[PDB]
Every structure is written in structure tokens, then in C-alpha cells.
Write a protein that binds this ligand. Structure first.
Ligand SMILES: *[C@H](Cc1ccc(C(F)(F)F)cc1)C(=O)O
Ligand SMILES: *[C@H](Cc1ccc(C(F)(F)F)cc1)C(=O)O
Lengths: 291, 299
């Protein structure tokens, strides 16, 4: 049995035109959507969501194709796993709950969905927080030897199918665990709750889920990059008030200032898994910003 | 069984301070060392070595850690699999045969051993040919989005052990065959002799051999890059007459005019493309052999 790490929260399967979105839902007050990244699921918010739920209705969603959300059929341009499409699908999900204007925080891939959502449909967001990321365009522009070695996933997982799928299927438990440990300050799994790690391992064990992650990275190399490049070339900035947080061992505020007209930010001592490695600091920063 | 693809050639298993070098040896005349790359072994010269042996004493060697050569234990700096160390080791092997001044042609990793040998110990070489490559420094300096997506293997295989080893171990035949096919002009295995593919597959089947390949790419990301960086920043050029040959659909040309790049690294360089992917001596054996015979035979 996978553990229930959100005591008090409901479990909802929310319909959209592209498939169901699974979410844990707790609290009352203004609506706040939380979006996880790779290689994780909604459970990564389990240490910060309760504190947010003291003041907000918190909706903790599995991204399209991740976790227990349905996996829409992809295509040659990876369309359903582009951040523009995932944002449209999560906008539909929020409309099923009657939420057309909400607060949003995302981490890693979910943060990519979130800033794309803010660029495409800023009217949907009261405030936005992004965790542990720079825009996809900035990672690719920075691409050099040092980055190619650090963020090798961006080129490896984007290789044409079935290359990464075939490699990942030999020992997916090792890969997911080694990858998680490698992004933390500690270099091991000690910053994660073992019950959460089990959620991540079980999702990663499904070849269909791993294919989705590769489609996500293929979109990140191609259409998501092109979408971002258009905004850079147009001089488009996010007008939604926003917060950028990042683990120092994972400036970023200088970068976000080029992408957003009202942005505040701060490093926190942590690797790339802020809500699990530094939950108190992360929750405090998010509560203060969204309140 | 593994086929003899150099019918009539002898063999040597040559001791050095870092372990044995296996080679096939044929012909007579001036000495010519041939060095293969990844994910191959000495057998990739089988369609050209017999032609070269009409004119030269040909030594077709497995790189340190590859094929039937011994695998020295590596270290945190990947030292024995750096091109500097491999070149020192192959200099020792050649001296065991009485060759202290010789001609050298390398392909892929073997071409990287070769130009590093030329930079560190130019007196060892009469002439040098590099096939299918740019210097390691130039590959890394050209890193951007397009290049990173095109040649992902450098950064993937250089990840800390045991991550690439663990990924490659689940289905190693799939990876080596897909990799080989991916480099050829047509994208399939048709360019290769199936007996040669079986040599490559059997080598790749051994986890210790795959570990060496990762160590070779870890050196390629770190010390090899640093060694090259020192030379290009110092303006050190190879003085040995050299030939650069590359497949037009191969790796070196991906985002470069290779001869222009080599002219930065070498004071006496000529070269040409050949219609081929990245496995010139198998995909275009007659043209490769002719180019090498003509270059090494000229004065
Ligand atoms: C997520 C970046 C990313 C990729 C891989 C890891 C880890 F540690 F698991 F290997 C962490 C973070 C993104 O692409 O947004
Ligand atoms: C060799 C470059 C290289 C890498 C991969 C392949 C292939 F086709 F097998 F995938 C060919 C050549 C080097 O690093 O020198």
C-alpha cells in the first residue's frame, strides 16, 4: 500500500478534454494549485501542503501523464506534454472545480507548466511561485560543457524513442532513486520520507509513465523551447506578481527579472527538492507570499 | 566463435607498464599503428588493414581497456583512460616491437589518443591521420542546444558511476547495435560485416568493458578536455604532418568545417570529407584505404 501523506485531504479525479487529473484537495479559502515535477508526483508537497491548507483551499495535482493522472496519447510534436498544453489541461481541471482565478506554485516541470500558464493566460492567476527553476529558454541558452554535464537529462531523455525508454527499463528503481539522491544537498535519500520515495518508485516502475516523462523532455527540447523563444523575442514579461525560490546547492532572481515585471525571490539552503529538503523555509516563504 | 577478420595476420599480446595491448600484425615496410574507437575494437580496420599491409608493417591494436587489451584499474581522475595515458601506454607497446618513430592513424577515441600523442610526444610520429573527429576541446566548446541533442553520448556516459553502467547493463546488445547503426550514413547495420558486429557486441557484453568505455568518456569530459584546453590556450600546434578525414554525415562535421578546425591545431594539415557516416573505414573502405596509402607513402 502507498501511504496517505495528506491527512484530512480529499481525493478527486477531475475530468478534462485530455483525460483525468488526479488531485488531493484540502483546506478552505482562496484556491491554490500545486504542481510537482520530475521524477515525482503530487506527494512531493506533503510537507508543505498542510501549512498552506491553514489559509487556502490547496489542490495538489498530478501533472498530465504523471502519477495517477490519465496519459493522453502523444504525437510527433509531443503536443499533450508541452507546457502550453499541460497548462490548458490544468486550466480545464480548475474550471471543473469552479476556479477561474487562482494562486499557483510549481516545482521543476510543474514550475514550467506554471510560468507558461502565466505567459499564455495571466488572467487565470492571482500570484505565481516557481521553485528550483529558470525558464526552459534560459537553460538551453546557457548550454555549454558544464551545463550539458549537470543537466544531462535534458539531452538524454529528449533522444528519440525508444532509446531512453529502453535504457530506463532495465532497472528503473535504481535510476529513480539514484536520480532523486543526486539532486539533494545530502547526495542520498535522507531528505525524503521513505513513503514518498515509494510513491515515486512505483510511478517510475510503469513503462508507460516513463515514456510520458521522456515525452515531457522531448517537448522541453523542442516546442517548449520555441514557445519561450517567441516570448523572449517579443519582449513579453509575466505581469502576475511572482516569487522565485531556489535551493542554493541546486543569480536566478536576475534571470527571472528579465521574464517578469513583478518578481521577488530568494535562495534557501537546499538542493533541487526544496519542498522536501527545506519544508519549513519553503512553506514559510509561500505562505507569506500568497497571503 | 569470433571470426578472424585479418586472415594471414599474426597477433601479439604486448606487455606495458599499464597492461597488455592486443594487436593484429601484418605486412612489411614502414611501421603503421591503427587505433579504433567506441564502441568498437581493432576489428573495425579489417576492410582497410589488408590493403595497407601491401605497403606497411601494420599494427592493429586494441586501445587500453578495449577488446582483448588489459583493463587497468581506474581512479577518480580516470587516469588510465585519459588520452595522455593511453598514448604513453601505446608508445611503450610500440617500443617493445622496436618502433620508436612510426606512422599513426586513429578513428574516434583512437584518433583522440593519436592527436594527444602528437601533442605530447611529436618525435614519436612521422605522420598522423585522424578520422571522424575534432579535438575534444572543440567538441565541448561547440556545446549548445543543437549539439547537445545531436551528440548526447558524451554527457550521458560521463555521468558518475555507476549510473551509466547500470543503465547500459539491462540490455547491452540493444544499446551497442542501436549505437552502431545510428552513426552510419543509412542508419542501419548494413555497412558493417556481421562478423565485425559480433566482435563489438561480445566486447560490449562484458560489464568491465562497458565500465572502461564510461571511464574513457569521463576522461573525455574532464582531464582530456583540460589537457586540450592548455594546448589551445598556449597556441601549441601539432608539427607532425597530418591528414584529417571525416564522413560527411559523421560526427566531426556536425557543426564545423573540420579542416578549418584542424588548421587551428596543426601546422601542416590536409584533409577531405568522404561520403559516409561516422564509421569511415567500414562504410567507405576503399576510399579510406586509398587516402591513407597515399598520405603515408608521400614524402
Ligand atoms: C527538473 C530538473 C531535474 C532533473 C533531474 C533531477 C534529479 F535530481 F532527480 F536527477 C532533479 C531536477 C526539470 O527539468 O525541470
Ligand atoms: C566517438 C564518437 C561516436 C559516438 C557514438 C557513435 C555511435 F554511432 F556509435 F553512436 C559513433 C561515434 C568519439 O567520442 O570519439
Amino acid at each position: 500500500d502507498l501511504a496517505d501523506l495528506f491527512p484530512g485531504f480529499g481525493s478527486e479525479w477531475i475530468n478534462t478534454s485530455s483525460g483525468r487529473i488526479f488531485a488531493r484537495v484540502g483546506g478552505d479559502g482562496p484556491p491554490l494549485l500545486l504542481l510537482h515535477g520530475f521524477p515525482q508526483t503530487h506527494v512531493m508537497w506533503h510537507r508543505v501542503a498542510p501549512k498552506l491548507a491553514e489559509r487556502f483551499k490547496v489542490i495538489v495535482a498530478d501533472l498530465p501523464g504523471y502519477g495517477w493522472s490519465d496519459m493522453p496519447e502523444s504525437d510527433e510534436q509531443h503536443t499533450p506534454y508541452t507546457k502550453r498544453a499541460m497548462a490548458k489541461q490544468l486550466i480545464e481541471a480548475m474550471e471543473q472545480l469552479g476556479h477561474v482565478h487562482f494562486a499557483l506554485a510549481g516545482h521543476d516541470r510543474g514550475a514550467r507548466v506554471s510560468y507558461r500558464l502565466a505567459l499564455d493566460s495571466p488572467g487565470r492567476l492571482s500570484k505565481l511561485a516557481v521553485l528550483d527553476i529558470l525558464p526552459t529558454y534560459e537553460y538551453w541558452q546557457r548550454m555549454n560543457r558544464a551545463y550539458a554535464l549537470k543537466i544531462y537529462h535534458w539531452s538524454f531523455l529528449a533522444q528519440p524513442a525508444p532509446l531512453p525508454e529502453n535504457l530506463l527499463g532495465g532497472d528503473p528503481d535504481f535510476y529513480v532513486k539514484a536520480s532523486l539522491a543526486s539532486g539533494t544537498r545530502a547526495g542520498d535519500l535522507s531528505a525524503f520520507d521513505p513513503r514518498a520515495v515509494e510513491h515515486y518508485r512505483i510511478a517510475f516502475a510503469d513503462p508507460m509513465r516513463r515514456h510520458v516523462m521522456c515525452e515531457d523532455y522531448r517537448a522541453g527540447a523542442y516546442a517548449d523551447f520555441e514557445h519561450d523563444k517567441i516570448d523572449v523575442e517579443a519582449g513579453n514579461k509575466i505581469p502576475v506578481p511572482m516569487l522565485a525560490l531556489w535551493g542554493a546547492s541546486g543569480t536566478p532572481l536576475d534571470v527571472w527579472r528579465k521574464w517578469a515585471s513583478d518578481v521577488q525571490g530568494a535562495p534557501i539552503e537546499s538542493g533541487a527538492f526544496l519542498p522536501e529538503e527545506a519544508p519549513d523555509q519553503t512553506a514559510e516563504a509561500l505562505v507569506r507570499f500568497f497571503s
